[PDB]
Ligand binder design. Structure first.
Ligand code: SF4
Ligand code: SF4
Ligand code: FES
Ligand code: ZN
Lengths: 114, 208, 48, 95, 82, 688, 126
């Protein structure tokens, strides 16, 4: 499996490109949250940005890390333009509950569930 | 026989066999299979490292113009080492002939994005990036086309099901459109239609 | 239809309930389907 | 004809008529629970079963391509009338 | 606490399991014949570590293995459980 | 050496002598269209469809029944091959009525698929097509005599396997009728297994008849229940529900068949199920409530009670998950008495010593046998496919079968020995006209039944079984390597409970009458409340409770076998499993789910939540329940025999007699047929 | 350009974006759909079907239809081998249970074995 690379030869440029992506997302929040006329503080949106980076801790392969950086760069293009809208950014937020449980007791009463 | 059976051609089949053998000889570097079916349209089947060389050679060399492009499709097949199949389909203007140029690839290894020799393939390449995931190195813009912005998954796969993982409705609580896990109103009763008794005996692979 | 008046079928409406969407007399849907699983009957007499 | 459920309404020809505490009744508020008062079984009772002098006979249903394909039924047993699967009307023999 | 039950998990080939085959050929009838209400049990499917386990003291599963172990060590841990 | 060169269209293949053209084509990948052949039935050349052309052969032969000489070459795409098949196809579709809508096998016909792929299109024979009057073959199998293509597959099946022999052909020529001459109904075992065999839609299912259509039902793997054999069955499920079941083949066990009881035991599965958790009411009335208050009440009461006076009877259909979760809970409280309905008598440590309680031989290995004796049961009713494979083995390689304990209604010309277990000990000690061939035999198999196992004669009868086993296995010039003494059961959870090492029977309940107990599947007459102390506290957990559910105190609506991914065990230790076909109706959670929720509401916990954790703990109880579909064979006959010699008794002088004596007795004696309308219909149509 | 190899699996399980319960909890089943016994012929064999576990289908409260909360209920992945089935299942992420392939054992059968002078196979009606 001597696979062709994408962007990085090892994990070093992978970490460098994803930290550059996170740099762009930190400096990308206030312009969009002031432009799109949202209802949410800047710090809460930045915390969901860092939470979405925290979701992907198990990602190992350099192809996959580079492909996540490609997806993030494409979405940052579509959010530095207004191709997307308020609906999509509020769809990144999960506000309209859906308070769907995790306890086995609450998976038992409200049941037919694992 | 004389009616009601579509008559086959002979000399066009001979010429396409000769031309496929011609191409297969004069490019020993990127040739695996050439084949002709009964309805006489040429097929070339290619390792994915000479895509721009084969398309430049099949745009010029003056005994094969083939100036018209079609469809690119990386038609998804499971079970294989290489799922995705890039399928070029070319038509010539001075010749009246049809070739299919099928090169193969897997889920992650990119190909060289042949937009620089055929300008038609730009939106085709963007579309097949959005629907499959065959990444395209040396390409200007990979945006998403035929999909929603906030949607992802490359949904023409056999993994993504028929109905989606997303559903949209409206609420007046926050005065906007929200997404939900999907809730079909009908089962989509799938029809088992796999008949017994050897539908075509001529296409019997060697049994394991 | 005054060229051919009769027909020897006898089940047809001869009242002609006309087009009716927008009344208190219109269609409502219901599945013509009996009970599916038929739950267990709790016993009539008590015990102890 | 329609029967009388304990709800005071029209039952169905197949037994789906409501229980006394179904809230589908209270989504039937103020509108017609429509029913076809002509029932299917009510016409078979008024059928004159004919008397054909052959043994195994045919049934088409009044002209080909207006009705059902050719079905062939038997008139052996005199304890049971020969019932068509498509027509829903019986046949008998005499001799 | 109350010495409820003992389990032995065996297989078809391992050297320690061959020692426990020597145990079941030599010194098994002493155990149950001397102990009528001490329900040990034997479990085999095809291939497993010869697990010597003990379920007692209200849901305590003591746990030793018997890979490349002697039959004297079988008797020794048998007495330690006993 | 018996490797014969035949060429399929030029390509070579080695073929045994005696094997036909068709098994050669199945070896290379071809099939020949055929009707009167069937791969697990007898062979005749009736249907004429399988015609085929050989190179240099002016005589076209039927490829179903040809002895294959050396060096053939077979054309399966030639000219007169297709001409002969299209001719025969135009022949067969002349006396067949236009019934393909109202036929029940419209999605699963054979005339239709072969008339597409091998037939002509523009028919002939403008006038004719006589029709034949039907008659009911029974209440369970709907019969139309008209669609019969006279293939003679049901008849040879009856003649060679069923042994009832009431189904023949009358008349001649065109006017040939199939079935019954004397208008006598057919109510025997495996009478439902003729709807899988009739290749056209002639003999179809009466209760299934017009409730579905095959191209709309999705299929799911399932395991045969109310037996101990476990056929490879399939729930052809439909519309949030079920609506069809069928059998499927396995390697060793249960070839292409099923119990008729099982086949028509889906209505009673869906008939009167328990759906809601229920608590008794102040006048004393069993009313229903939410899981909250009910399980809080039961969990607080379980926090109250302690000691050996808490019991759990796992009768009938319960799970691996049910038994493991119940064992973990009842160990976690302080102590236990886990019990089963059918009492398994132990006097020489019968709980452990794996080989003594199960069918030690191979089910397909009864064909390998020569000398099989049968000590009391009636195997026509208990596991009928076991009896069917015994009869097929006796048909082919001529079994020598004895019967000891009771003269019963088995139909394959059995030898009989004095119908009393004292005469079985007279076999074990003295000589008899079966004992000479039995002792100087080659291959000993001893099938023990469990109908007469509930009486207290179990120790000495099991000792005589062990004496026969040891004496013949160390006798007859053999050291072993093939087995004897295989015993069987009825309930799968019995063998699962023995594999988990449980306190057998209600012995510990009749010794210590307990305070709190859990009735998991209580329908037989195990206990009464008036044979129980003043702590009358039972949690009856089950499904469609008839007997015990008006008696009960707390109803818990458990799920059934179609509704939960439960691992079950057949009579020979093989571990099969089901998948969740339909999520259960009502509230109706699973078994381990209810037990772990009860543990959560009570003041304790169970350290597993998911099924992967369940099966890790399942292997950490016993390794025999993760290696699915792998046959397990135990040993140590001498150790079991030297432990079995502790206490022996004088036998009871009563000759044993089965309760499973007739067909109606087989029908009404289980919970699902006790529920279902259609089994009541077939019982009253046997009587009347 | 001859990049390094590693003894690892593939990790598209966060590239395809399927939600997490549908990732983990869907215990797949790889099976051979065997011969439909009411039919005849094993043409429908030779294709390994990876399918998924079923979940609830409840009554539609207006029509009695089976409305489901399942995207992953109607999938059927068609394979040719078993190793590639294991490879695809490790590639995309979920777990699975495996049935074997249980071919029919060929048995010796003959019409000249159906008839005999001193063996007990006797059709007596043909
Ligand atoms: S069995 Fe006969 S009636 Fe039924 S589908 Fe086949 S051809 Fe039609
Ligand atoms: S009833 Fe069915 S199985 Fe029997 S001869 Fe007729 S078509 Fe064949
Ligand atoms: S199968 Fe050979 S003739 Fe019927
Ligand atoms: Zn008719």
């Amino acid at each position: 499996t001597s696979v062709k690379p994408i962007f990085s030869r090892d994990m070093n440029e992978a970490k460098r490109r994803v930290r550059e992506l996170y740099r762009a997302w930190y400096r990308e929040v206030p312009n969009t949250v002031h432009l799109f006329q949202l209802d949410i503080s800047v710090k809460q949106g930045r915390d969901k940005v860092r939470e979405m980076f925290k979701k992907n801790a198990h990602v190992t392969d350099p192809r996959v890390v580079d492909l996540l950086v490609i997806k993030g760069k494409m979405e940052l293009e579509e959010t530095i333009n207004v191709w997307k809208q308020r609906t999509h950014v509020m769809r990144f937020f999960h506000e309209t509950e859906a308070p769907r449980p995790k306890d086995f007791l609450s998976k038992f009463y409200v049941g037919h569930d694992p | 026989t004389r009616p009601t059976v579509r008559p086959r051609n002979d000399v066009a089949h001979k010429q396409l066999s000769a031309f496929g053998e011609y191409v297969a000889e004069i490019l020993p570097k990127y040739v695996q299979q050439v084949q002709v079916s009964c309805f006489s349209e040429l097929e070339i089947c290619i390792h994915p490292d000479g895509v721009i060389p084969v398309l430049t050679f099949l745009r010029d060399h003056s005994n094969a113009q083939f100036k018209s492009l079609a469809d690119l499709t990386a038609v998804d097949i499971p079970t294989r080492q290489n799922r995705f199949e890039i399928v070029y389909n070319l038509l010539s203007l001075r010749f009246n002939s049809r070739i299919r140029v099928k090169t193969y690839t897997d889920e992650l290894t990119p190909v060289e994005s042949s937009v620089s020799v055929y300008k038609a393939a730009n939106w085709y390449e963007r579309e097949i990036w959005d629907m499959f995931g065959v990444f395209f190195a040396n390409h200007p813009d990979l945006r998403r086309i035929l999909t929603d912005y906030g949607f992802e998954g490359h949904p023409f796969r056999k993994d993504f099901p028929l109905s989606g993982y997303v559903e949209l409705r409206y609420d007046d609580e926050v005065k906007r459109v929200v997404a939900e896990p999907v809730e079909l109103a009908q089962e989509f009763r799938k029809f088992d239609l796999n008949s017994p008794w050897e539908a075509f005996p001529a296409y019997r692979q060697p049994p394991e | 239809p005054t060229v051919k008046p009769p027909t020897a079928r006898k089940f047809i409406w001869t009242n002609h309930k006309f087009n009716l969407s927008g009344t208190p007399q219109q269609y409502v849907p219901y599945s013509t389907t009996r009970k599916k699983i038929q739950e267990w009957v709790p016993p009539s007499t008590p015990y102890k | 004809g329609v029967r009388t459920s304990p709800t005071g309404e029209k039952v169905t020809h197949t037994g789906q008529v409501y229980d006394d505490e179904d809230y589908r009744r209270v989504r039937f508020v103020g509108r017609q629970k429509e029913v076809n008062e002509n029932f299917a079984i009510d016409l078979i009772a008024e059928q004159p079963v004919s008397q054909v002098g052959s043994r195994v006979i045919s049934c088409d249903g009044g002209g080909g391509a207006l009705g059902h394909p050719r079905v062939y039924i038997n008139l052996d047993k005199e304890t049971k009338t020969g019932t068509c699967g498509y027509c829903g009307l019986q046949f008998r023999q005499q001799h | 606490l109350g010495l409820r039950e003992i389990r032995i998990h065996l297989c078809q080939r391992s050297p320690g399991s061959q020692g426990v085959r020597d145990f079941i050929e030599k010194r098994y009838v002493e155990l149950k014949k001397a102990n009528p209400d001490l329900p040990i049990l034997i479990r085999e499917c095809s291939d497993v570590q010869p697990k010597l386990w003990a379920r007692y003291a209200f849901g305590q599963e003591k746990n030793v293995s018997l890979n490349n172990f002697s039959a004297d060590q079988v008797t020794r841990a048998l007495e330690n459980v006993l | 050496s018996n490797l014969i060169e035949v060429f399929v269209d030029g390509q070579s293949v080695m073929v045994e002598p005696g094997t036909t053209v068709l098994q050669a084509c199945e070896k290379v990948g071809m099939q020949i269209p055929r009707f009167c052949y069937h791969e697990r039935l007898s062979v005749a050349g009736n249907c004429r469809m399988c015609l085929v052309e050989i190179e240099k052969a002016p005589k076209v032969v039927a490829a179903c029944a040809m002895p294959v000489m050396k060096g053939w070459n077979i054309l399966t795409n030639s000219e007169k091959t297709k001409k002969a098949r299209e001719g025969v196809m135009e022949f067969l579709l002349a006396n067949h009525p236009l019934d393909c809508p109202i036929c029940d096998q419209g999605g699963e016909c054979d005339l239709q698929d072969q008339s597409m792929m091998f037939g002509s299109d523009r028919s002939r024979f403008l006038e004719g097509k006589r029709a034949v009057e039907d008659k009911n073959i029974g209440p369970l199998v709907k019969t139309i005599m008209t669609r019969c293509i006279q293939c003679t597959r049901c008849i040879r099946f009856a003649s060679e396997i069923a042994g009832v022999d009431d189904l023949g052909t009358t008349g001649r020529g065109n006017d040939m009728q199939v079935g019954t001459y004397i208008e006598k109904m057919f109510m025997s075992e495996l009478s439902g297994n003729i709807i899988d065999i009739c290749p056209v839609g002639a003999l179809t299912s009466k209760p299934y008849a017009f409730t579905a259509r095959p191209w709309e039902t999705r299929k799911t793997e399932s395991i045969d229940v109310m037996d101990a054999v476990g056929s490879n069955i399939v729930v052809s499920t439909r519309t949030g529900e079920v609506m069809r079941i069928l059998p499927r083949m396995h390697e060793d066990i249960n070839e292409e068949w099923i119990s008729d009881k099982t086949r028509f035991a889906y209505d009673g599965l869906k008939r009167q199920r328990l759906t809601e958790p229920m608590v008794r009411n102040e006048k004393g009335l069993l009313t229903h409530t939410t899981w909250e208050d009910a399980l809080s009440r039961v969990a607080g009461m379980l926090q109250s009670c302690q000691g050996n006076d808490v019991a759990a009877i796992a009768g009938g259909l319960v799970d691996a998950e049910a038994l493991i979760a119940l064992k973990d809970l009842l160990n976690r409280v302080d102590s236990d008495t886990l019990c089963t309905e059918e009492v398994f008598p132990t006097a020489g440590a019968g709980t452990d010593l794996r080989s003594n309680y199960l069918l030690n031989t191979t089910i397909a290995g009864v064909e390998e046998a020569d000398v099989v004796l049968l000590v009391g049961t009636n195997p026509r009713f208990e596991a009928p496919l076991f009896n069917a494979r015994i009869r097929k083995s006796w048909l082919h390689n001529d079994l020598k079968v004895a019967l000891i304990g009771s003269p019963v209604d088995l139909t394959y010309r059995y030898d009989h020995l004095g119908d009393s277990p004292k005469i079985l000990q007279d076999i074990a000690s003295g000589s008899h006209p079966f004992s000479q061939v039995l002792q100087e035999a080659k291959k000993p198999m001893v099938v023990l039944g469990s109908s007469a196992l509930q009486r207290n004669d179990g120790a000495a009868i099991l000792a005589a079984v062990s004496n026969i086993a040891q004496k013949i296995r160390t006798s007859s010039g053999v050291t072993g390597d093939w087995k004897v003494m295989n015993i069987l059961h009825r309930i799968a959870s019995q063998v699962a409970a023995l594999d988990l090492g449980y306190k057998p029977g209600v012995e510990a309940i009749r010794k210590n009458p307990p305070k709190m107990l859990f009735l998991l599947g209580a329908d037989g007459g195990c206990v009464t409340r008036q044979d129980l102390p003043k702590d009358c506290f039972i949690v009856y957990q089950g499904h469609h409770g008839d007997v015990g559910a008006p008696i009960a105190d707390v109803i818990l609506p458990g799920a059934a076998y179609t509704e939960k991914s439960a691992t079950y065990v057949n009579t020979e230790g093989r571990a099969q499993q089901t998948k969740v076909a339909v999520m259960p109706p009502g509230l109706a959670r699973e078994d381990w789910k209810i037990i772990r929720a009860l543990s959560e509401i009570a003041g304790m916990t169970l350290p597993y939540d998911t099924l992967d954790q369940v099966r890790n703990r399942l292997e950490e109880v016993s390794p025999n329940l993760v290696r699915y579909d792998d046959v397990e064979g135990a040993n140590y006959f001498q150790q079991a025999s030297e432990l079995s010699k502790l206490v022996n008794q004088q036998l009871l002088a009563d000759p044993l007699v089965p309760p499973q004596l007739t067909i109606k007795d087989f029908y009404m004696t289980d919970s699902i047929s006790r529920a279902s309308q259609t089994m009541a219909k077939c019982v009253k149509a046997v009587t009347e | 350009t001859q990049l390094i190899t590693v003894d690892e699996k593939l990790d598209i399980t966060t590239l395809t974006g399927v939600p997490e319960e549908h990732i983990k909890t869907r215990k797949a089943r790889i099976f051979v759909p065997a011969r439909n016994n009411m039919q005849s012929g094993v043409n429908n064999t030779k294709k390994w079907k990876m399918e998924f576990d079923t979940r609830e289908r409840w009554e539609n409260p207006l029509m009695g239809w089976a409305s489901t909360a399942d995207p992953l209920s109607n999938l059927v992945l068609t394979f040719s081998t078993k190793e590639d089935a294991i490879a695809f299942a490790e590639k995309n992420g979920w777990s699975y249970d495996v049935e074997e392939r249980k071919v029919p054992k060929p048995k010796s059968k003959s019409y000249g074995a159906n008839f005999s002078w001193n063996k007990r196979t006797r059709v007596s009606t043909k």
